Amino acid sequence: DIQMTQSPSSLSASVGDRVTITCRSSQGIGSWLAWYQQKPEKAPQSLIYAASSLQSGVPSRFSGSGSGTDFTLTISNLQPEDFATYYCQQYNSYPLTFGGGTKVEIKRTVAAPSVFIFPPSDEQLKSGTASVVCLLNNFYPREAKVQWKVDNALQSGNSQESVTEQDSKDSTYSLSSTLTLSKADYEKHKVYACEVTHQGLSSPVTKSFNRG
Amino acid sequence: KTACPSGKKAREIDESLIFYKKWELEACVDAALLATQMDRVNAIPFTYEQLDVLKHKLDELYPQGYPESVIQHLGYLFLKMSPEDIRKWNVTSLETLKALLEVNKGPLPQVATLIDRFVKGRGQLDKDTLDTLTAFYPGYLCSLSPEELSSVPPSSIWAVRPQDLDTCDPRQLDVLYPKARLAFQNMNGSEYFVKIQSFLGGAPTEDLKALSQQNVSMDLATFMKLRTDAVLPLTVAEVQKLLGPHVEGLKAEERHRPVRDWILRQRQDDLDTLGLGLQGGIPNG
Amino acid sequence: EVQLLESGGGLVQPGGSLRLSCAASGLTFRSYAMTWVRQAPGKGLEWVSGISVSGGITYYADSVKGRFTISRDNSKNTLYLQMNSLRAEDTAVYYCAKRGAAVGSFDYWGQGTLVTVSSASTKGPSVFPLAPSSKSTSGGTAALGCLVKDYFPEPVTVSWNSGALTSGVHTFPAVLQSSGLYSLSSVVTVPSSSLGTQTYICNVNHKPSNTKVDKKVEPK
Ligand SMILES: *[C@@H]1O[C@H](CO)[C@@H](O)[C@H](O)[C@H]1NC(C)=O
Ligand SMILES: *[C@@H]1O[C@H](CO)[C@@H](O)[C@H](O)[C@H]1NC(C)=O
């Protein structure tokens, strides 16, 4: 087991930038290093073999260098197609190893979340379980905080959150909270409300609704 | 010839002399004064015509050679100095060489014959000699002859950069590799290679085989420089040991030069193991 | 024309068996070393095994030591991974990769086949509308969506008004309730004026269960 470790883990940069990613093997691996691009919901693609050599069909703005235990993928003049996860791999010795990856994000101004909320469909309530949603639309950066109060009783560990990959057009994130209750528990209470701290908003916004 | 008009008799090498005509300079300038006052003649904006007349003076004064003194401050007259004249100098200094070659920057038949006279005296082409020579004409070393290169002390090889060895043809690198292999055999591994790397143009098979065993990491560029004849009798093993991870790019040069011949001389059943998908060879058994 | 088409990937009960299959096309499969590389849902990349150009020598991760078996068949243009004693931890997308050389880098990867390893049965999804009756109060903008509860295994495809409506749509990545049932939701954000005039259906498709559904979303 040769330990590969990358730096950073996450990096936000704008287009037409010179971005430097680091890879550092625990042991000497001479020049048996590779670089792999992965854009979400797609397979990885080869960029660099032998620590330095370009794979074919790959832009030249991609420049690998290094040997021993220190390496550097450097993407000169960034494009939109280059915002992706980057993976360094050793093929010196078995077992073969990749690094953590490096999520390379687009950078931009902040943005306040547009915020909505959605009582349960009576279609759902027939079956039994009864589920309130809280949608945060386009915001920046990812760090928001949904927080469900029901009759001013903070609900903890009964809501699963979920966030989009940064948009292509607006280069911005969206979020969905999912407060799941029982039929009975939904019936029992009046005011529902997700309170939503984000950097973009000045004070924690709290959209609310009452049963019926 | 003629006597110098009244007053025009130059008692010093001043600025006035730029105004004297060809024939006035012939007559009025003492030859012996020119030699002792040679330091000044650089500054004085003479025409080429006017200098031809100052050259021919000193020629008279020293018809057997030229003191290093004169040679030092010879200035812009080096260009007018016919190769024949220079073939008989006692230069024997580095600063005068520098001096003469600085203006030579401003082939050149004179330049060649001069350098040959510095080494012809100095006895061997020393490190510091070749250091300053390449600081004016880097490709000097790869301009010389196969035979000529023998005289070079192996100690001098250290002074050579990779820069020099781009214009170098095989029949030259042949004579150069041995010497380097002696200059660089006080080293091993991550040390030895960096140094020896350029010269492998000369290197034969036997010497390449040894390198493999020392787990050297070569690139495809360096490989494409290796002697065709020296590549042929290497195993698929020894090729993949030299090239290490750079072997991946070898597919590309399939129909090139050093490796073209190598592939054919090898069995298909041998190549297949490289995972490259090269074709051409013997399908045996 | 280069295509590596992995298949055989499905749902399996823990300690179960499964054999994967990478179909090569547009290369000389005979003359290349392949490997298997897997990726945990929302984690990083991991090498699993690797076969030579011979079929002779086979390497594996200590993770899968003597539970997996890499095989190859140059005749049928196929690469195989037998997988026995599968645990929860072996759930991932498995990429079949082609090295550009024995002891080289993987230069071509497959689209990659998903293996889920759970006791949970194949459940087709319940679908539910998110009516925008009080998201229109946003002013100029009105968010509406539908919601995909109690489904297994991954994945589901959700498009809106039959792939036609595309702009301002967010199909969120699925979570997975205490139930061990994945749960998704998709929304789309549209002008308030259109509501009623323009009808909105979301089209769920869950290939695992054969369950596909068209559901309409309307305020009042
Ligand atoms: C050059 O130096 C040698 C060695 O002393 C001497 O014999 C010879 O006369 C010199 N030649 C000239 C032209 O001065
Ligand atoms: C070369 O690498 C091999 C492993 O293949 C090992 O014997 C040792 O690390 C190296 N040997 C020499 C002589 O450098």
Q: Which amino acid residue places its CA nearest to atom 2 of ligand 2?
A: B215
Selected residue of B217, B247, B254, B269 to mutate for chain C interface (largest C Cβ count, 10 A): B247
The burial of A142, by beta-carbon neighbours within 10 Å (0-12 exposed, 13-18 middle, 19 or more buried), is given as middle
Mention every residue, 6+ apart, whose C-beta is less than 8 A from residue A29.
A2, A68, A69, A90, A92, A93
First-to-last C-alpha distance (Å) of chain B: 97
Distances (CA, A) of B156 to B119, B124, B152, B203: 13, 9, 7, 19
In-domain check, residue B277: yes
Q: Is the dihedral of CA B11, B15, B17, B20 positive or negative?
A: negative
Q: Do B248 and A50 touch (CB under 8 A)?
A: yes
Structure tokens at C22: 């990478």
Locate the ligand 2 atom nearest the alpha carbon of residue B214 and give its number. 14
| Cis peptide bond N-terminal to C153, omega within 30 | yes
- CA dist A49 and C100 (Å) reads 9
Distances (CA, A) of B117 to A165, B60, B76, B97, B134: 75, 22, 19, 11, 17
Any chains having at least 3 CB pairs less than 8 A from chain C are A, B
> For residues C21 and C106, is the Cβ–Cβ distance under 8 A?
no
Nearest to B184 by CA among B216, B152, B155: B155
Q: Among all chains, which residue has been given the structure tokens 């300079």?
A: B25
- CA dist B42 and B74 (Å) reads 8
Shortest distance between the Cα of C32 and any Cα of chain B, in A, equals 5
> For residues C160 and C203, is the Cβ–Cβ distance under 8 A?
yes
> For residues C98 and C6, is the Cβ–Cβ distance under 8 A?
no
Q: Is the dihedral of CA B207, B209, B214, B215 positive or negative?
A: positive
Q: How many helices (H) does chain B have, and how many strands (E)?
A: 16, 0
Nearest to C182 by CA among C114, C98, C112, C132: C114
Residue C107 Cα to ligand 2 midpoint, Å, equals 27
- CA dist A197 and C17 (Å) reads 47
> At C6, is the secondary structure helix, strand, or coil?
strand
Q: Do C100 and B245 touch (CB under 8 A)?
A: no
Torsion-angle region of B208 (φ positive above 0: left; ψ -120 to 50: alpha; else: beta): alpha
> For residues B142 and B164, is the Cβ–Cβ distance under 8 A?
yes
Q: How many domains does chain B contain in total?
A: 2
> At B228, is the secondary structure helix, strand, or coil?
helix
Per this entry, what is the length of chain B? 285
B221 and B254 co-located in one domain: yes
HSE-CB of B8 using CA atoms within 13 angstroms: 16
B229 and B173 co-located in one domain: no
Query: Any bridge partners for residue A86, and if so which?
Result: A37, A102
Q: Which amino acid residue places its CA nearest to atom 6 of ligand 1?
A: B90
In-domain check, residue B37: no
Ligand 2 contact, B217 CB (< 6 A)? no
B178 and B253 co-located in one domain: no
Q: Domains in chain C, ordered, with CATH?
A: 3-117 (2.60.40.10), 126-217 (2.60.40.10)
CB atoms within 10 A of CB C102: 19
Selected residue of C103, C105, C107 to mutate for chain B interface (largest B Cβ count, 10 A): C103
The answer for A 143-172 residues in CB contact with B (under 8 A) is none
> For residues A140 and A110, is the Cβ–Cβ distance under 8 A?
yes
- Buried b / exposed e over B50-85, threshold 16 CB at 10 Å, is bbebbeebbeeeeeeebeeebbbebbebbeebeeeb
Q: Among all chains, which residue has been given the structure tokens 């011949």?
A: B261
Locate the ligand 1 atom nearest the alpha carbon of residue B88 and give its number. 13
Ligand 2 contact, B215 CB (< 6 A)? yes
- CA dist C96 and A138 (Å) reads 37
Ligand 1 contact, B124 CB (< 6 A)? no
First-to-last C-alpha distance (Å) of chain C: 52
Ligand 1 contact, B69 CB (< 6 A)? no
The burial of C111, by beta-carbon neighbours within 10 Å (0-12 exposed, 13-18 middle, 19 or more buried), is given as middle
> At A139, is the secondary structure helix, strand, or coil?
strand
Q: Which amino acid residue places its CA nearest to atom 1 of ligand 2?
A: B215
According to CATH, the superfamily of the domain at A4-106 is: Immunoglobulins (2.60.40.10)
- CA dist B61 and B67 (Å) reads 11
- Ligand whose nearest atom lies closest to the CA of B88: 1
Structure tokens at C37: 């590389």
| Cis peptide bond N-terminal to C129, omega within 30 | no
- CA dist A21 and A52 (Å) reads 14
Structure tokens at A19: 């971005």
CB atoms within 10 A of CB A33: 29
- Residue of B69, B89, B90, B122 best suited for mutating to test ligand 1, as the one with most atoms within 8 Å of CB: B90
- CA dist B208 and B237 (Å) reads 13
The domain in which residue B210 lies consists of 203-285
Ordered DSSP codes for B64-92: S---HHHHHT-GGGGTTS-HHHHTT----
Contacts 24+ apart (CB under 8 A), B21-26: B22/B49, B22/B50, B22/B53, B25/B50, B25/B53, B25/B54, B26/B1, B26/B2, B26/B53
Question: Cβ contacts (< 8 Å) between B246 and chain A: which residues?
Answer: 31, 50, 53
Q: Do B272 and C31 touch (CB under 8 A)?
A: yes
Query: Any bridge partners for residue C71, and if so which?
Result: C80
> For residues A38 and B250, is the Cβ–Cβ distance under 8 A?
no
Distances (CA, A) of B113 to B85, B109, B117, B203, C83: 10, 7, 6, 32, 79
Question: Cβ contacts (< 8 Å) between B219 and chain A: which residues?
Answer: 50
- In CATH, the number for domain A114-210 is 2.60.40.10
Selected residue of C38, C99, C105, C154 to mutate for chain A interface (largest A Cβ count, 10 A): C105
Nearest to A149 by CA among A196, A188, A115: A196
Question: Cβ contacts (< 8 Å) between A67 and chain B: which residues?
Answer: 217
- Edge-to-edge order in the sheet of strand A130-139: A115-118, A130-139, A173-181
HSE-CB of B32 using CA atoms within 13 angstroms: 1
Shortest distance between the Cα of C140 and any Cα of chain B, in A, equals 58
- CA dist C149 and A48 (Å) reads 43
Size of interface B-C (CB pairs under 8 A): 38
Query: Any bridge partners for residue B159, and if so which?
Result: none
Question: Cβ contacts (< 8 Å) between A51 and chain B: which residues?
Answer: 245
> For residues A135 and C187, is the Cβ–Cβ distance under 8 A?
yes
Distances (CA, A) of B251 to B208, B242, B246: 21, 16, 11
Q: Which amino acid residue places its CA nearest to atom 7 of ligand 1?
A: B90
- Ligand whose nearest atom lies closest to the CA of B62: 1
Experimental method: X-ray
Any idea what the Cα angle at residue A142 is, between residues A136 and A144, rounded to 5°?
Answer: 55
> At A10, is the secondary structure helix, strand, or coil?
strand
Nearest to B227 by CA among B249, B257, B248: B257
CB atoms within 10 A of CB C166: 10
Structure tokens at B9: 């008799």
Instruction: Delimit the domains of chain A by residue range.
Output: 4-106, 114-210
> For residues A114 and A140, is the Cβ–Cβ distance under 8 A?
no
Distances (CA, A) of A196 to A113, A133, B114: 9, 13, 86
> For residues C153 and C11, is the Cβ–Cβ distance under 8 A?
yes
- CA dist B270 and B209 (Å) reads 18
Structure tokens at A185: 């528990």
Ligand 1 contact, B92 CB (< 6 A)? no
> For residues C82 and C38, is the Cβ–Cβ distance under 8 A?
no
Q: Which residues of B touch C (CB under 8 A)?
A: 240, 245, 247-248, 251, 272-277
Q: Is the dihedral of CA C43, C44, C50, C53 positive or negative?
A: positive
User: Which residue from B minimizes the CA distance to A90?
Assistant: B245
- CA dist B205 and B212 (Å) reads 11
First-to-last C-alpha distance (Å) of chain A: 60
Ligand 1 contact, B90 CB (< 6 A)? yes
φ, ψ dihedrals at B191, nearest 5°? -90, -60
Q: Do B245 and C33 touch (CB under 8 A)?
A: no
- CA dist A78 and A17 (Å) reads 5
Q: Resolution (in Å) of the shown entry?
A: 3.4
- CA dist A140 and B95 (Å) reads 68
Pairing of strands C141-151, C182-191: antiparallel
> At A154, is the secondary structure helix, strand, or coil?
strand
Q: Is the dihedral of CA C70, C71, C72, C76 positive or negative?
A: negative
Query: Any bridge partners for residue C114, and if so which?
Result: C93
Q: Among all chains, which residue has been given the structure tokens 């539970």?
A: C67
Per this entry, what is the length of chain A? 212
The burial of B135, by beta-carbon neighbours within 10 Å (0-12 exposed, 13-18 middle, 19 or more buried), is given as exposed
CA A37 to chain CA centroid, Å, is: 16
Q: Which amino acid residue places its CA nearest to atom 10 of ligand 2?
A: B215
- Determine which helix (DSSP H) or strand (DSSP E) holds B210, and give its type and residue range: helix B205-213
Identity of the amino acid at B17: L
